[PDB]
Amino acid sequence: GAELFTGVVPILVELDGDVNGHKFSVSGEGEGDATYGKLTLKFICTTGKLPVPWPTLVTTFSYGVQCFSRYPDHMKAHDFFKSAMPEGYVQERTISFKDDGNYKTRAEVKFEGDTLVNRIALKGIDFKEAGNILGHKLEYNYNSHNVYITADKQKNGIKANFKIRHNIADGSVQLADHYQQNTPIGAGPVLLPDNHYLSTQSALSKDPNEKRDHMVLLEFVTAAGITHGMDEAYALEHHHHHH
Ligand SMILES: [Ca+2]
Ligand SMILES: [Ca+2]
Ligand SMILES: [Ca+2]
Ligand SMILES: [Ca+2]
Ligand SMILES: [Ca+2]
Ligand SMILES: [Cu+2]
């Protein structure tokens, strides 16, 4: 499945959401370049004004297509996400906003022809109408995060739990605790990984010529946490080691 990702792959993202009865839809288009761990995506709220802050949806849309992560060669044996392709994987999360509501997301990530599709349903409940989310108190920016991946042998898939921190307008932070589970759609074999993490950097921007409510996302994702043999083979002073 890795061979499906050596070039630039078109991406489509479709989301329907209901957060405290505020219904919305988003369509995204992008390009994924796993050779460089690189994603470029543009999301448009097709229903009008998005009723939650754009940053709160980044992981759902993208930490949404982790098949575009760069797994270094020495780690490619641990790449569940590409191994599940083209048939795809289910990705489910609960995202719990501290002192506020939660999103539950269910997505299917798979190829449709040459295009990698992420189809999502999102349900949000227990939000405070004047809290950081429904009150639009989150800054339009995004921090770097590590996503630790573990095998879920029972389900022939993977799991992850990680904390996203969203900068708030008053200078504080809104924690969004993520629990994630992924399971393969195909009946074919998949790679079950050793423990490792995805180091993810995300930059949000806008096209000044776009009048609709939208977000541009530029993201780089690299698998890490397992040290290549090179360091000991060549005595390279940059890894953790002892004398
Ligand atoms: Ca392009
Ligand atoms: Ca092992
Ligand atoms: Ca040394
Ligand atoms: Ca070293
Ligand atoms: Ca040590
Ligand atoms: Cu670590």
UniProtKB/Swiss-Prot annotation:
Q: What is the effect of changing residue 63 to W?
A: In W; leads to excitation and emission wavelengths intermediate between tyrosine and histidine but is only weakly fluorescent
Location in chain, cross-link 5-imidazolinone (Ser-Gly): 62-64
Keyword DNA damage present in the record's keywords: the answer is no
Effect listed in the UniProt record for changing residue 102 to T: In EBFP1.2; shifts the excitation and emission spectra to shorter wavelengths and increases quantum yields compared to BFP
| Outcome reported for the amino acid change (mutating residue 200 to I) | Suppresses the 475 nm excitation peak, leaving only the shorter wavelength peak at 399 nm. In H9; increases fluorescence at 395 nm excitation
What are the recorded Gene Ontology BP terms? bioluminescence; generation of precursor metabolites and energy
Q: How is it used?
A: Green fluorescent protein has been engineered to produce a vast number of variously colored mutants, fusion proteins, and biosensors. Green fluorescent protein can be mutated to emit at different wavelengths such as blue for BFP (when Tyr-63 is replaced by His), cyan for CFP (when Tyr-63 is replaced by Trp), and yellow for YFP (when Thr-200 is replaced by Tyr). Further generation of mutants led to more stable proteins (at 37 degrees Celsius for example) with brighter fluorescence and longer fluorescence lifetimes.
Tell me what the record says results from residue 61 to L: In EGFP; increases fluorescence at warmer temperatures such as 37 degrees Celsius. In EBFP; gives rise to variants with blue fluorescence
What result follows from mutating residue 203 to K? Answer: Abolishes the tendency to dimerize and leads to monomeric fluorescent proteins
**What does the entry state regarding organ or tissue expression?**
Photocytes.
Superkingdom to which the source organism belongs: Eukaryota
Q: Which residues carry this modification: (Z)-2,3-didehydrotyrosine?
A: 63
Please describe, based on the UniProt annotation, the reported consequence of changing residue 159 to Q.
In R10-3; matures to the red-emitting state with excitation and emission maxima at 555 and 585 nm, respectively
Which Pfam families does the record cross-reference, listed alphabetically?
A: GFP
The listed outcome for residue 36 to N is:
In EBFP1.2; shifts the excitation and emission spectra to shorter wavelengths and increases quantum yields compared to BFP
Q: What is the effect of changing residue 203 to V?
A: In EBFP1.2; shifts the excitation and emission spectra to shorter wavelengths and increases quantum yields compared to BFP
Result when mutating residue 145 to D: In Cerulean; leads to improved quantum yield, a higher extinction coefficient and is 2.5-fold brighter than ECFP
User: What result follows from mutating residue 66 to H?
Assistant: In P4; leads to no detectable fluorescence. In mut2.2; shifts fluorescence lifetime from 3.03 to 1.94 ns. In mut3.3; shifts fluorescence lifetime from 3.03 to 1.88 ns
What happens when you mutate residue 142 to A? Answer: In Cerulean; leads to improved quantum yield, a higher extinction coefficient and is 2.5-fold brighter than ECFP
How does it get modified after it is made? Contains a chromophore consisting of modified amino acid residues. The chromophore is formed by autocatalytic backbone condensation between Ser-62 and Gly-64, and oxidation of Tyr-63 to didehydrotyrosine. Maturation of the chromophore requires nothing other than molecular oxygen.
Give the consequence of mutating residue 168 to V. Answer: In EBFP1.2; shifts the excitation and emission spectra to shorter wavelengths and increases quantum yields compared to BFP
Q: Which family does it belong to?
A: Belongs to the GFP family.
Subunit architecture: Monomer.
Which protein, by its recorded name, is this? Answer: Green fluorescent protein
The primary gene name is: GFP
